[PDB]
Symmetry: D2
Subunit: 253 residues, 4 copies
């Protein structure tokens, strides 16, 4: 099915050296995309690139700090110079910080906003600058269940992801007319290392299973279909949507 094929396209996935970003990058590569691996640690990025190459994927290392405008600008300039077009941007980079709001230092709030929200804006804007003259491109922002429903102790993350949902709509509002589709994925509770602490908590584990209609956690590879869909011609008239991949959790009391 050509409509899901990504051959001839290049995807930059931020924070793809590990975790969900890597699982999505891997799935995009299987669908045919060349992959630009990104992460803060150059050595960790390089290791992930070699592993992608070892299984026959076309991959390049594009390490940069997603909170640094100058590094973002220089990374895209370097890509321009090598003749590498970024056709698909997945804004996956982001951190979590657990603390009740009355105990939350403004500096930590700010770090979560910068890493999750401002990063997506800066990187999205740089990608779009080049996609616009080409007349096509895909932007896939990674939100969260907290883009819509709040949870105690994760306020700055919740706010940043709520911002990401609206950033997605703002991107569609301005860029859809130029043939660019900006959409989002909202992962539910996934079996991934960032969640290991939650997964290890028997009470939290029980809550996830009782709160989710599917009665189970999601696996990281279960984000791949949605990521491929939103990166492929299959979603050419889809714009400004956030698709939750959460076993039904957001849909029910």
């Amino acid at each position: 099915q050509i409509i899901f094929d990504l051959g001839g396209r290049t995807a930059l996935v931020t924070g793809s050296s590990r975790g969900l970003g890597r699982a999505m990058a891997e799935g995009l590569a299987v669908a045919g995309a060349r992959i630009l691996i990104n992460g803060t640690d150059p050595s960790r990025v390089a290791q992930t690139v070699q592993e992608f190459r070892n299984v026959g994927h076309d991959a390049e290392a594009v390490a940069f700090d997603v909170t640094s405008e100058s590094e973002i600008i220089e990374a895209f300039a370097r890509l321009d110079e090598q003749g590498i077009d970024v056709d698909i941007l997945v804004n996956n980079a982001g951190i979590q910080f657990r603390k009740p709001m009355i105990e939350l230092e403004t500096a930590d709030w700010q770090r979560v906003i910068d890493t999750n929200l401002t990063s997506a804006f800066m990187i999205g804007r740089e990608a779009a600058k080049r996609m616009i003259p080409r007349g096509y491109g895909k932007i896939v922002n990674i939100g969260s269940l907290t883009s819509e429903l709040a949870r105690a102790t994760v306020a700055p993350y919740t706010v940043a992801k709520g911002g990401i949902k609206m950033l997605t709509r703002a991107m569609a509002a301005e860029w859809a007319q130029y043939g660019i589709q900006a959409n989002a994925i909202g992962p539910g509770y996934m079996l991934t290392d960032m969640n290991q602490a939650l997964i290890d908590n028997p009470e939290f584990d029980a809550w996830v299973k009782a709160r989710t209609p599917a009665k189970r956690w999601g696996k990281p590879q279960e984000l791949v279909g949605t990521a491929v869909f939103l990166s492929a011609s299959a979603s050419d008239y889809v714009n400004g949507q956030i698709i939750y991949v959460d076993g039904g959790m957001l849909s029910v009391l």
Copy 2:
């Protein structure tokens, strides 16, 4: 060129209601191309036959399954025939529904009811019948067809708006009850699409200009542009997606 398999529908049988023409036909053809066996359903049996034949000529496995989507007896009867034939309905696309344009202060209750019955009640009855076979098997996909009016109202199309809003909530209710048995119930909300059901809107320059101005993509959608979403929601690619409505509207719903 990619050998990925998460979008393949081989071995699955899809029933698409109102698939003899329009968006339903386009989605049915898309499902067939992805590998699904197709059951075509429609009012005009002549239009149905022509559609089934056209599917067969291009190598699709297709068949007519006749029933009034508003008739419970006809629905239960149709599923009985499928049951005996060992046909599993693995994918149900609830696309059947009519439109009726009339301001509410002039709207006869009988026209209100017909819109509700054909759009909303049909989806409940047919979804209920499909699910009781899906549950024991432990897998299944239900794709309801909503509308932009599942979310935003428009003057003169109230009963449709109400029915499509119901469809969105019906989708969530289905996820609530069936997700645990391995069934994914999701929905598609087509925007303004180039179909004959909208020809009166397309051939009005004011409304045409409005669509292009109101939509960020600045264009109407083509029926084929629902295929990707329909296949995605019918395939293993969406196994952990439940209760979602995905709008295919060039961004119309996302902006002022």
Copy 3:
């Protein structure tokens, strides 16, 4: 008083107000100053509620009719017209609950939920709106549910009907706001009423409500009153097509 929340001089029809939440809201509107048209299916129950309202100083009239009967709805408004009684405020509160898994759900029970909740609100809203329009002002307050937004197993037809109510509210705004009519909705969460007695008397369900709600408690019937008055008053003249969830924060958190 606070004049923007005053309903003096205005007349409110509240369907299903002979008892339960409908009665509590009708009483709230009366306290706010509205003359109340009490409605229910039983004329005797309706009249008794009317007399109780009047004995504590509220003005109230008996307007019994079956909300699923179009001919009775039309007949009732014809009576009101002839008396010169304007319906300035309509609260569509009537509607039944029916709990049953969808695979066990008879279509007739589904239909009764749809008719009593959704079709009734359309028919009555339509009759009210055509008299409000030439006056250039009016309020329609539909009663949704927190299930207008989020579903729950065993309550599909109610969820669907109330989801319909949310969109009906928006459809009413779309057509009638231009004429100075505001159509809005209330989505109650879990309320300590008699139609929820089973839920309330179930320790597992009671515990779930208290744990699932940020406010860690059920709502009281009186806690809908403020929203009903707000949406019935001058205070909400630029508010249209809104549904206000009164649910202790349930819909807003995981």
Copy 4:
């Protein structure tokens, strides 16, 4: 009526020297609340306080830059010392900045985020710390139609207001159990000096009237009912909700 009465309560409205904030503060005063007026121009704040006192309202100036954490903290310390409780907080302060994203400077993006979103978090956090031991409080964040629907050229405002909506829910998530209701108002197109460029653009004016079911702009005082509702006992069981006051605009195509 008692359920809308604010007697015995004190409300802090940020950016209430003029515009929407001033209109809401006046309605809160009419409802019985003691009012704390805040704004950047000390003369305009003092003049507004005077006008409130002329009609018998209890009003007082409370000075702080809403983007300065130290000034916010000091302001609440002065309130504590004077025995002034903030029972009701209306986070109304904010700025607008119009510019397409590809041309938007990050510094401007950041100033809009800080002024609209971070401000509401810092001030809400400071207010909540006092409301919690009292077992009572109302927080009303001021969102926008852009909390829900995007518009080209106002992306950082859109994102900030989307953040406001989710912040409101995060507040409900952590604080509802302590008897604090956190909710939001999303004003539609209102006739304020801040909007005077749009109002005076005949194309934008005609668009508002055609796009709004009510076919008209809102007047600032039309926010009063919603503000009082969300500040009074009438909304004791309302938490985490945003109420749009937009003549129906968000509700229709």
